[PDB]
Amino acid sequence: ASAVTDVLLCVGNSMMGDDGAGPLLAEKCAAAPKGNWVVIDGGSAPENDIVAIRELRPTRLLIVDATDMGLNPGEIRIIDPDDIAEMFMMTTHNMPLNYLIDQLKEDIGEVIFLGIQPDIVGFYYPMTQPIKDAVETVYQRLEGWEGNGGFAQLAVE
Amino acid sequence: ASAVTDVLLCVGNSMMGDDGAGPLLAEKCAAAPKGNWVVIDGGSAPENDIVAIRELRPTRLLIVDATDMGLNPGEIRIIDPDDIAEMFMMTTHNMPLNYLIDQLKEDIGEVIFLGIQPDIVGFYYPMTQPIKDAVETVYQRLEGWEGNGGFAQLAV
Ligand SMILES: [Ca+2]
Ligand SMILES: [Ca+2]
Ligand SMILES: [Ca+2]
Ligand SMILES: [Ca+2]
Ligand SMILES: [Ca+2]
Ligand SMILES: [Ca+2]
Structure with missing residues (x-):
């Protein structure tokens, strides 16, 4: 047995x-x-x-x-x-x-999509501080994560 | 309204x-x-x-x-x-x-996937005669198509 439960898929491009x-x-x-x-x-x-x-x-x-x-x-x-x-x-x-x-939701049964707002996106740009901070925030919630990890739902109308 | 019922998605690369x-x-x-x-x-x-x-x-x-x-x-x-x-x-x-x-099946209902067996697949190759024939065969079934157009299920 693998004993796998939770999987975290990280999407993005460090060159952007x-x-x-x-x-x-x-x-x-x-x-x-x-x-x-x-x-x-x-x-x-x-x-x-x-x-x-x-x-x-x-x-x-x-x-x-x-x-x-x-x-x-x-x-x-x-x-x-x-x-x-x-x-x-x-x-x-x-x-x-x-x-x-x-x-994925049909095969897994809890799927959570978490977005982080970028500021600048472009080839060879640096990462900005608010995004570095957001990445730390999410990282610190991974241990003992429950539900939506205490994050708010995006409001789209 | 568009009055659309049937959609045919053709997949492939003419340069292959x-x-x-x-x-x-x-x-x-x-x-x-x-x-x-x-x-x-x-x-x-x-x-x-x-x-x-x-x-x-x-x-x-x-x-x-x-x-x-x-x-x-x-x-x-x-x-x-x-x-x-x-x-x-x-x-x-x-x-x-x-x-x-x-x-697609959730969004559309009836979804039919039709495969044609290629022989040769490569950059700038010609198409081979049996594949030309197969395309003609499928083409001639599009008018009045019902069910799976009379084609067999792949046995695998
Ligand atoms: Ca990937
Ligand atoms: Ca992205
Ligand atoms: Ca499914
Ligand atoms: Ca700890
Ligand atoms: Ca396409
Ligand atoms: Ca062959």
């Missing part, structure tokens, strides 16, 4: 400034593990991470990604899968993200 | 030899429409065609794609979603195909 939030989280976890999470350093596209996640047979999947939500830099929100669909959130390959989330 | 089966079907349809199908010339990856298919609000989606099924060149089969999953069929972006099909 604040889009590096996900890879940064993966780096922190590698250096100092928190909780029971198996952490996937997913990079730019979640599509090619799906097969591994399903094979891990998790009970709970957390996805962390820098995502423009129209908020102040570094704000953290959980995005409801219905709002993922309504917002037309896309992967880098222009796949609608709700397709992946909704299907 | 027998992988051009899908694009060829799109070309035939554009030149001489068959049935009520709205035909999407989907190219290499179906991922970026999903939003348009969903917006079209079809009741039935037929997907046509050159796919290695371990059969003789030009053989045509319908691949059941269970088998798509078990085979670990992948898109060009390594997205499992079964996730895409299963979610």
Whole structure:
């Protein structure tokens, strides 16, 4: 037995400034593990991470990604899968993200999508302080995570 | 309203030899429409065609794609979603195909996946005769298509 329960999929590109939030989280976890999470350093596209996640047979999947939500830099929100669909959130390959989330939810049964608001996103940009702070905030909630980890739902109307 | 019922997604790359089966079907349809199908010339990856298919609000989606099924060149089969999953069929972006099909099934209802067996797949290869023939065969069934268009299920 693997004894796997929780899986954390970190999405992003460290070569794209604040889009590096996900890879940064993966780096922190590698250096100092928190909780029971198996952490996937997913990079730019979640599509090619799906097969591994399903094979891990998790009970709970957390996805962390820098995502423009129209908020102040570094704000953290959980995005409801219905709002993922309504917002037309896309992967880098222009796949609608709700397709992946909704299907994962059928196989896993708790799937949480967590967005962190970037400020600057561009090739070889540095990460800004509010995003570094947000990544620390999420990291510190990984141990003993329950529900939505105490984070607010994104308000989309 | 658009009055749309049937959508045909053609998958493939004309610059990859027998992988051009899908694009060829799109070309035939554009030149001489068959049935009520709205035909999407989907190219290499179906991922970026999903939003348009969903917006079209079809009741039935037929997907046509050159796919290695371990059969003789030009053989045509319908691949059941269970088998798509078990085979670990992948898109060009390594997205499992079964996730895409299963979610389309929720949004559309009836989703049919038709595979055509290629022989040769390579950059700037020609298409081989059995695959040309297979594309013609599928084309001729589009008008008045019912069920799985008379094609056999892939045995795997
Ligand atoms: Ca990936
Ligand atoms: Ca991102
Ligand atoms: Ca499913
Ligand atoms: Ca501790
Ligand atoms: Ca496409
Ligand atoms: Ca061959």
